Amino acid sequence: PLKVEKFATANRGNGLRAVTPLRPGELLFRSDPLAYTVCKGSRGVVCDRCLLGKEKLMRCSQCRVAKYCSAKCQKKAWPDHKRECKCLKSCKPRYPPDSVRLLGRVVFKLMDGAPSESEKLYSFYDLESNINKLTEDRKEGLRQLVMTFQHFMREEIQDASQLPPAFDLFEAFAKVICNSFTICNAEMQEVGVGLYPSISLLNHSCDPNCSIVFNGPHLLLRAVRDIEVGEELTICYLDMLMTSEERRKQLRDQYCFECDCFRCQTQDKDADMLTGDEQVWKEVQESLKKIEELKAHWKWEQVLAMCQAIISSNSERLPDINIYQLKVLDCAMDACINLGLLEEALFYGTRTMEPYRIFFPGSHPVRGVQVMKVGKLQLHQGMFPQAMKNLRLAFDIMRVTHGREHSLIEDLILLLEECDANIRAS
Template identity: 35%
Template sequence: MKSARKGELIFEERPFTHVLDHSQQGQRCHSCLERSEHLKKCTACGLLRYCSLACQRCDWPIHRRECPCLKQVAPNVPLDSVRLMLRILIKTQLLEKEDQSTTETVWRRTFHDLMSHIEEIQVDPSRSQQFAQIVYTLRELCQGQLDLPPVTQLMEVFGKVTINSFTICDGDLQAVGVGLYLGASYLDHSCQPNAVVSFQGQKLMVRALRDIPEVKPSNIFISYTDQLAITEDRQRQLKEQYYFSCQCCRCQDISLDRLLKSFVCPVPTCTGAVCRIQVGELLPCGSCGMNSYEESYRRKVEDTFHHLIQDLQQIEQAKKAKDLDKVLSLCQKCLNPDTVMVLHSNNLLHIQALDRGLDVAIDLGLWEQALKYGLQLIPLYIKVYPSGSPQVGLLLLKVGKLELYLQRLECALQHLQQGESIIRVTHGRFHELYCQLSELIDQCTDELRVHMEHS
């Protein structure tokens, strides 16, 4: 089979079926998932909205069966997971005697081919409860409209959807929907992937992060988890969500976890760091080798750790409540001088506080504050994310946009060009995110030239 060069599109695929995230209602089309200011409601259910007649017609084969179900429970809106299950059931019934393979991928695959992990789900209390709630809601939805298959078959479908669905993201990696992609579900996970998934509307694209000598499913790895998390958290997420453990090189590298768990060495003359591996236990400093710490320092580390955990939890709660001022206040608390004196800049909690602070400062229009956080994050992201991660490219883009707005043109151009070298690989030259980035580089170049001509 053919090879794939770094940045090359390996394949693209449209979903077997998908649903728009409820938070995006009224902002995006339910069919193509593109943002639009001119959405028209389905006149029957009043829930789904489309940007064009073409999108409505494209969605109609499924929606005409889904529509009466949604209408009879209105104004209540089923959870996204329930709607995805309903759409899967409708589509599999429609295609019961037809070929269900994808047409845009290099591998033929049917819904029947997907793994369900029923045995694991049956002994998983959380998943079993979730399944029971979905079945209860489906029965309310479908009563008098659609015949549901037996519970055993429903669990099979639930398992396949749960294990194989993808969160559909926009260019900023924000969730806009969830979908089932038969071809992409072939691909295995690695915390150090050689390929990356991006989306253009509902269309999924897989690109090579580095050269792949032979393009076949067993040679292509994408990441299922948050790559910024420490190994034990990634492993827990993989076990809980997908029922397997990862043995990749990143999971075997303990130096990264020590970096993400690091605190400032208490020796005044040392610039190194100690690692908190568990409550009350600190590894020797990586620079001076000091491993005999006073009890007061151990308590300070524990207090700092627990206070930060609580503050970050409150930040997430304030974000959900859309209380941006409180989010910013909590971020500033996490980054106060007393905390920074104990918490090493490489510590994951410090990175998370900076990350939340950057986003909320942008939302509040505090450009200088946002830039301050962004500039601190760049070397940390580069250090802890795998090479070529889109998260690094997006951060460089954010920082470059801030610097361009604040007329720090030389720095802006440098960061935008660094971001371009990553986004070109992860998203491709025709993705709208890359096009926006290219326009910013052109704008910055023009402004810098004018500035130099007048100086």
């Protein structure tokens, strides 16, 4: 059997609980998506199937919207793509919202595909919609998505007989809002959106006992803390670099619940996250809206320029533990890595280390990868003792958060063996 089970919680609907004590690093579930698509900003930049950023991609002959790294990827993707292809084509100039493209793949998967293992524990039909908690503002947004779906899919779906039985598009989009998974690449950049209905049983905590990590579209659910028999399994739905007030708004707006976890009751880390002059980090927070938009579109040169204007401003500066300063540093590190500016990348990366230790407590895949990036930059620059220490730290974290089932662990072990060989060679 499995190590987890669905159960009805007392006040958060259905959830997942351990059937037996779980232990940090234990693999609990792994799932391909019911449906997934590349995210808007990564479209044309990464392969539609494997979500890897190749320097050579080939677009689908028919729609010219889907792009693939290889014949292998377009073939393995053709079942999921064949019907949307006609739709994307017939709307050529327009491209639909990610949610619409995603729901299209859900519908085709449910109509034309064998039962999906992703629904082993919990199906798309089962997913929470929160419709009785939605604001009229949200409901209006969903109505527009319904009509967008109807437009985009009018070449393949003209009426209900071409939808699953009693399939309601409004409810379907409501489910998408609060059960969408952000698919991240190995470097922890957002590249796609997917539905993993069994995994959607996991409720949220700002101090979770499990973590999900993506290896392409494939999702690994791991325990990151000790977990007792019958204890509910939780993951954090949100970015860790967020104050309690910011988490409140997004958990309300997107997930329709008021978080009662101990961190939100205590404002845990809020004060440290907002150190520095408020006027400055308000401006940086504003600037980050565009920086992250640029990063989403892989516009690294422009990302770096905006980040440098902040990190090396001629006006007042922020401490690196300020979460908005910290985001700017991370964006600039990633841009430098992609632009081949490794000295500068390392300068920014090392500055994020201590803030990441604070804000990503325990075993968090984002900190694991950040430390691995820093260790990799140090290795490449011949800083073997430093690189080894960070690579070991990355492995300490990622043996828990990634595990041997994740291909990045093999890469990291190879970097450990290389770095150790250099240190031996003295």
